[PDB]
Design a protein around this motif. Structure first.
Motif, PDB file in Angstrom:
ATOM      1  N   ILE A   1       0.695  -1.216   0.011  1.00 16.63           N
ATOM      2  CA  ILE A   1       0.095  -0.348  -0.369  1.00 16.63           C
ATOM      3  C   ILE A   1       1.549   1.318   0.149  1.00 16.63           C
ATOM      4  N   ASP A   2       1.654   0.962   1.075  1.00 15.51           N
ATOM      5  CA  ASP A   2       2.712   2.893   0.698  1.00 15.51           C
ATOM      6  C   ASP A   2       3.067   2.436  -0.199  1.00 15.51           C
ATOM      7  N   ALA A   3       4.057   1.483  -0.995  1.00 18.39           N
ATOM      8  CA  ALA A   3       4.345   1.822  -1.911  1.00 18.39           C
ATOM      9  C   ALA A   3       4.153   1.935  -3.262  1.00 18.39           C
ATOM     10  N   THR A   4       2.874   2.221  -3.848  1.00 17.51           N
ATOM     11  CA  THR A   4       2.281   2.074  -4.135  1.00 17.51           C
ATOM     12  C   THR A   4       1.433   3.554  -4.109  1.00 17.51           C
ATOM     13  N   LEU A   5       1.135   3.939  -3.294  1.00 18.11           N
ATOM     14  CA  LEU A   5       0.788   5.336  -2.914  1.00 18.11           C
ATOM     15  C   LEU A   5       2.228   6.084  -2.941  1.00 18.11           C
ATOM     16  N   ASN A   6       3.237   5.931  -2.318  1.00 19.35           N
ATOM     17  CA  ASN A   6       4.711   6.836  -2.563  1.00 19.35           C
ATOM     18  C   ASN A   6       4.614   6.787  -3.792  1.00 19.35           C
ATOM     19  N   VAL A   7       4.817   5.602  -5.077  1.00 13.16           N
ATOM     20  CA  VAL A   7       5.206   6.506  -6.081  1.00 13.16           C
ATOM     21  C   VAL A   7       4.214   7.055  -7.433  1.00 13.16           C
ATOM     22  N   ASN A   8       3.264   5.908  -7.493  1.00 14.34           N
ATOM     23  CA  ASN A   8       2.210   6.211  -8.180  1.00 14.34           C
ATOM     24  C   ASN A   8       1.388   7.814  -7.856  1.00 14.34           C
ATOM     25  N   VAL A   9       1.220   8.268  -6.343  1.00 15.02           N
ATOM     26  CA  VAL A   9       0.381   9.193  -6.481  1.00 15.02           C
ATOM     27  C   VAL A   9       1.120   9.861  -5.728  1.00 15.02           C
ATOM     28  N   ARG A  10       2.513  10.172  -4.144  1.00 16.88           N
ATOM     29  CA  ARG A  10       2.768  11.326  -3.624  1.00 16.88           C
ATOM     30  C   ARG A  10       3.789  11.890  -5.541  1.00 16.88           C
ATOM     31  N   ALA A  11       4.809  11.086  -5.608  1.00 20.08           N
ATOM     32  CA  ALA A  11       5.723  11.360  -6.172  1.00 20.08           C
ATOM     33  C   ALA A  11       5.036  11.667  -7.331  1.00 20.08           C
ATOM     34  N   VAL A  12       3.758  12.774  -7.818  1.00 22.20           N
ATOM     35  CA  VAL A  12       3.599  12.353  -8.695  1.00 22.20           C
ATOM     36  C   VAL A  12       3.082  14.198  -7.913  1.00 22.20           C
ATOM     37  N   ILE A  13       2.305  14.278  -7.290  1.00 25.20           N
ATOM     38  CA  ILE A  13       2.290  15.635  -6.690  1.00 25.20           C
ATOM     39  C   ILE A  13       3.575  16.289  -6.433  1.00 25.20           C
ATOM     40  N   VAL A  14       4.425  15.678  -6.113  1.00 23.30           N
ATOM     41  CA  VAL A  14       6.046  16.080  -5.336  1.00 23.30           C
ATOM     42  C   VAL A  14       6.882  16.204  -6.611  1.00 23.30           C
ATOM     43  N   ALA A  15       6.247  16.338  -7.951  1.00 23.85           N
ATOM     44  CA  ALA A  15       7.120  16.159  -8.872  1.00 23.85           C
ATOM     45  C   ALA A  15       6.477  17.614  -9.722  1.00 23.85           C
ATOM     46  N   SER A  16       4.992  17.596  -9.570  1.00 26.30           N
ATOM     47  CA  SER A  16       3.712  18.188  -9.741  1.00 26.30           C
ATOM     48  C   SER A  16       4.283  20.437  -8.971  1.00 26.30           C
ATOM     49  N   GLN A  17       4.764  19.851  -8.402  1.00 26.11           N
ATOM     50  CA  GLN A  17       4.632  21.084  -7.277  1.00 26.11           C
ATOM     51  C   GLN A  17       6.314  21.810  -7.727  1.00 26.11           C
ATOM     52  N   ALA A  18       7.227  20.735  -7.515  1.00 27.30           N
ATOM     53  CA  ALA A  18       8.059  21.336  -7.714  1.00 27.30           C
ATOM     54  C   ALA A  18       9.091  21.837  -9.070  1.00 27.30           C
ATOM     55  N   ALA A  19       7.943  21.774 -10.028  1.00 27.10           N
ATOM     56  CA  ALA A  19       7.853  21.818 -11.510  1.00 27.10           C
ATOM     57  C   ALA A  19       7.248  22.941 -11.705  1.00 27.10           C
ATOM     58  N   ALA A  20       6.710  23.133 -10.784  1.00 25.12           N
ATOM     59  CA  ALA A  20       5.312  24.419 -11.006  1.00 25.12           C
ATOM     60  C   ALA A  20       6.453  25.841 -10.816  1.00 25.12           C
ATOM     61  N   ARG A  21       7.917  25.382 -10.016  1.00 27.86           N
ATOM     62  CA  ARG A  21       8.677  26.418  -9.136  1.00 27.86           C
ATOM     63  C   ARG A  21       8.991  26.993 -11.177  1.00 27.86           C
ATOM     64  N   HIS A  22       9.524  26.467 -11.581  1.00 26.96           N
ATOM     65  CA  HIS A  22      10.716  26.783 -13.091  1.00 26.96           C
ATOM     66  C   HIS A  22       9.418  26.809 -13.881  1.00 26.96           C
ATOM     67  N   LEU A  23       8.643  25.988 -14.237  1.00 27.97           N
ATOM     68  CA  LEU A  23       7.728  26.102 -15.557  1.00 27.97           C
ATOM     69  C   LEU A  23       7.784  27.503 -15.720  1.00 27.97           C
ATOM     70  N   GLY A  24       7.220  27.648 -17.212  1.00 28.45           N
ATOM     71  CA  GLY A  24       6.051  28.815 -17.101  1.00 28.45           C
ATOM     72  C   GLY A  24       5.210  28.725 -17.662  1.00 28.45           C
ATOM     73  N   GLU A  25       4.745  30.623 -18.849  1.00 33.29           N
ATOM     74  CA  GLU A  25       3.791  30.109 -19.517  1.00 33.29           C
ATOM     75  C   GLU A  25       4.285  28.854 -20.668  1.00 33.29           C
ATOM     76  N   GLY A  26       2.988  28.839 -20.969  1.00 34.07           N
ATOM     77  CA  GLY A  26       2.853  27.533 -22.223  1.00 34.07           C
ATOM     78  C   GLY A  26       3.850  26.371 -21.581  1.00 34.07           C
ATOM     79  N   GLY A  27       4.205  25.853 -20.503  1.00 33.93           N
ATOM     80  CA  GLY A  27       4.403  24.856 -19.925  1.00 33.93           C
ATOM     81  C   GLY A  27       3.184  23.845 -19.979  1.00 33.93           C
TER      82      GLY A  27
END
Ligand SMILES: NC(=O)c1ccc[n+]([C@@H]2O[C@H](COP(=O)([O-])OP(=O)(O)OC[C@H]3O[C@@H](n4cnc5c(N)ncnc54)[C@H](OP(=O)(O)O)[C@@H]3O)[C@@H](O)[C@H]2O)c1
Ligand SMILES: NC(=O)c1ccc[n+]([C@@H]2O[C@H](COP(=O)([O-])OP(=O)(O)OC[C@H]3O[C@@H](n4cnc5c(N)ncnc54)[C@H](OP(=O)(O)O)[C@@H]3O)[C@@H](O)[C@H]2O)c1
Ligand SMILES: NC(=O)c1ccc[n+]([C@@H]2O[C@H](COP(=O)([O-])OP(=O)(O)OC[C@H]3O[C@@H](n4cnc5c(N)ncnc54)[C@H](OP(=O)(O)O)[C@@H]3O)[C@@H](O)[C@H]2O)c1
Ligand SMILES: NC(=O)c1ccc[n+]([C@@H]2O[C@H](COP(=O)([O-])OP(=O)(O)OC[C@H]3O[C@@H](n4cnc5c(N)ncnc54)[C@H](OP(=O)(O)O)[C@@H]3O)[C@@H](O)[C@H]2O)c1
Lengths: 246, 245, 245, 245
Positions: C107-133
């Motif tokens: 359960i933890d591996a699936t939520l960590n890899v398949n869900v939390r990693a998506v949220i964390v990477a999305s948030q991190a990328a939003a600090r760099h992405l700009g218009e048109g990202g």
């Protein structure tokens, strides 16, 4: 003291099957109930007699769903007979069997006229009478959103149409306080879909719990939606299909 | 009684929607256990009201974020009542915040409370539930329609329960247990008070612009887990005033 | 070049759908970074092929289950490339097994890899992405339709990404960044081989009974993130041979 | 040419989204026929542009409300081009008006044009399409989410096409023909001008608040019917700027 004390209902296609079960359940909950039918006059009168035996008012109206004037006039006749209208259940429907290659214009027109246009026409006519707290429910199908095999496409389209109608009509009638919902049965033991039919094993195989539904249970769910604890259920689809659409 | 002799567990039953669910299941005839995190006095008041109807009731402090506590709570209810027939996964949190400010603690708490606790309790309940057992989880209209910024983590957590519910209906089909999700819209509770700062905006999204009653959400749950709900399975039932139309 | 000058990160790009996405974005003009967990050889082969095209490319060992590693990988790519235009959240796991046998580790591996990693990477990328990202995640046809037992945890993890995607599109709308999810059906990879034992059952669910090609999934992702995809936003695009019809 | 040698019919190809689709399929290599109701000059200008690319093109006046005309149009194209590979059911109407004012003429016209014509053309095209054939219909984001009053007949007519599309994918699976629906949101055309009275309200529903381009809708249709779209089947692809998030 009745859950539907004083309520006034019309169930289209109430002579048999799911519609008869809905009519009886609304009556059991306290409503005066009118039904429409196409041909089954004796069975329709028997539904009426049973409802009258409870002390309710009831009427059966022969009204071909394919004829928009007959549909609109039936709605108006109910409002005149009962003094008003609180609940409309659009339930009359047909399932024309056939392959794509063999599909006829007559089957296309019949299905769109009965399963779609009659719902639109009755809903508009009922909206002239319904007030705050009124309820419109239509009978959809689990096939409206998930089609497992060939030969169902026209029927699936006709039931999917009712999803867009239901959601839009909830917006139309919101300011006046009328809810609009769709109940989607899966395989339910009726003349249209008998539990001992040749295709019944295949239909049960799609379910999570492999048992045809009871018309009386579909009726129970409709009665909940249109009842005193259903006011916040609106614009939505409620599926009762044994898990076929999981 | 519609639920004569039934044995139910409602997680997060001390307040709000969960308290209304616990009270309604008891009114319909069930013995009812609830969990809570901190509201011990309110939880015991829910219990005392249920006992006054002549039902059995208990309240178990069990942090949904702790999967051992969740599993143990399910087992403890089965031990206390002799079995378990109905599980309602209702405890949940809504951590407010922008994307920019989102913390790992908020991500972990939301996934642990709103998703992992549901999975763990459902698995544990499946060891006890018999033919005709019922599992319902509390979802959200936001699981499928997200109207504004600031809701993404919460919407993700509730959308997760849709896939869980549909898959678990398949898992438990042969054993005859239904699995469903009830998705409330705006419902007047401590989490979402009808006089709160966002409540006008929430009402504006509805077709009929009035917050829902926790007691009506409870009525719908009670229908789904009751004697006429056996063919409702693997599905979502939304009670949201038309917000998702 | 369709993606001339664009700067992309594809998580789980060492093989399967992620490698196909990485190669296609590079073929369309982008500099491409990938993450991987353990497949250093295969990751380096993907990088070397992209470099042979004349693009910049890097491979980062970054365990999706580690939120710090995920955030740092996003920041490393943005630093190396001078910015970031495209994030593809593709790394994922499918833990096989019955409900009875489901472990807390699974359960933890699936939520960590398949869900939390998506949220964390999305948030991190939003600090760099700009218009048109552009942000895309890899979902699954199982997120909305679950045909059999044994898939419930995985289905839950992919359904979570639907709520995340729709909410994140609202979050990033004012900044001009689209967020979408591509939902493959049965696609021939190490996770889901077309000549496997259970592949006949999966083909039988489709309208046209043939496993999908990872390169076609990559083609659809490339359309979504390319110059004609700007109005595709907040949505799920399914490429599943009709399984969900 | 991505659509080298392909033979296509686009209903309602004289203006708007249909004209953009016809032009894009021709730019991608297809011979293209269009239908129209009354805009003969516009239709001939579309044909002349396609012929100037070296492709074959024809325009057919064929009222979608007349099922015989629709069937005859499909047969005429197949006869003229020697076969048929792609059918795009795009011709559609939006009858504005309130529920109170809705006429039977409006209801019949909308069902005849927006629904029955799609059914009839699909059946007729299935007599000519072979393995690798493609059917796509133009839906609407309103088919699944209706934000305001006045849209209900139209929303019903587009929702109908979702059930048709999924069922027809099952029907035509054994023959190798995919069936899909593309759901545009607000797209700048005569039906929905970006400077119209309701355009501000429509933009306000989007995540990125700009009307879509008809050419982008055409690009997505062209992807679905092209050489990388074989596994896209029975599904809806929404291009609505995030309105349905
Ligand atoms: N049974 C299922 O498994 C199932 C599943 C999903 C959805 N549904 C839907 O549920 C509804 C009721 O189905 P059912 O199974 O109860 O069907 P049924 O046994 O065939 O009963 C049909 C009812 O509709 C009436 N009706 C049909 N065409 C009509 C027309 N032109 N004018 C007036 N009344 C008309 C019939 O009247 P007469 O008695 O006069 O013929 C009868 O009362 C339909 O909308 C159907 O599509 C059924
Ligand atoms: N209200 C709405 O408009 C709305 C709309 C959609 C969905 N929902 C969902 O409905 C459910 C109930 O919401 P509500 O509005 O009734 O919320 P609420 O007023 O905040 O009540 C929350 C309940 O959950 C319990 N709980 C929370 N976190 C817990 C934890 N870690 N361990 C154990 N118990 C915990 C609380 O226990 P304590 O009393 O000990 O704190 C309380 O009983 C939630 O799942 C929520 O996401 C609510
Ligand atoms: N194949 C299908 O039929 C199918 C269908 C629907 C959805 N999907 C989804 O598509 C995505 C790609 O799947 P696939 O079939 O290409 O699978 P695959 O062949 O198993 O490849 C998985 C990829 O994810 C990486 N990965 C896994 N766990 C990771 C972790 N903890 N940290 C970093 N990277 C990690 C792997 O890296 P290593 O090489 O280092 O192990 C590899 O690059 C997944 O999200 C999957 O759920 C697949
Ligand atoms: N524009 C949007 O925002 C939007 C959004 C979602 C969906 N849609 C759908 O996209 C499709 C194209 O819309 P549009 O915006 O391009 O509309 P449009 O500007 O009104 O163009 C309509 C096209 O359909 C043709 N047509 C209409 N009724 C016909 C009939 N009875 N017989 C034959 N051809 C007929 C017209 O032919 P004539 O030129 O001869 O009149 C014209 O080529 C429609 O299905 C519409 O519902 C549009």
């Amino acid at each position: 003291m009745n859950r539907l004390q004083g309520k006034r209902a019309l169930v289209t296609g109430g002579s048999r099957g799911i519609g008869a079960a809905i009519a009886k359940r609304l009556a059991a909950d306290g409503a005066d109930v009118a039904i429409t039918y196409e041909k089954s006059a004796e069975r329709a009168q028997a539904v009426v007699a049973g409802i009258e035996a409870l002390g309710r008012r009831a009427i059966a109206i022969q009204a071909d769903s394919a004829d928009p004037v007959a549909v609109r006039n039936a709605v108006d006749r109910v409002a005149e007979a009962f003094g008003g209208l609180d609940i409309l259940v659009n339930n009359a429907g047909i399932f024309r069997a056939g392959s794509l290659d063999d599909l006829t214009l007559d089957d296309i027109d019949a299905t769109l006229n009965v399963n779609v246009r009659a719902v639109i026409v009755a809903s508009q006519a009922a909206a002239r009478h319904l007030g705050e707290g009124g309820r419109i429910v239509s009978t959809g199908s689990c096939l409206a959103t998930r089609v497992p095999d060939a030969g169902m496409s026209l029927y699936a389209a006709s039931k999917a149409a009712l999803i867009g109608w239901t959601q839009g009509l909830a917006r139309d009638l919101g300011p006046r306080g009328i809810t609009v919902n769709i109940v989607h049965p899966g395989s339910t033991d009726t003349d249209m879909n008998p539990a001992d039919g040749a295709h019944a094993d295949a239909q049960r195989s799609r379910m999570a719990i492999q048992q045809y539904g009871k018309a009386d249970d579909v009726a129970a769910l409709v009665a909940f939606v249109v009842g005193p604890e259903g006011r916040s259920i609106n614009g939505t689809g409620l599926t009762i299909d044994g898990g076929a659409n999981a």
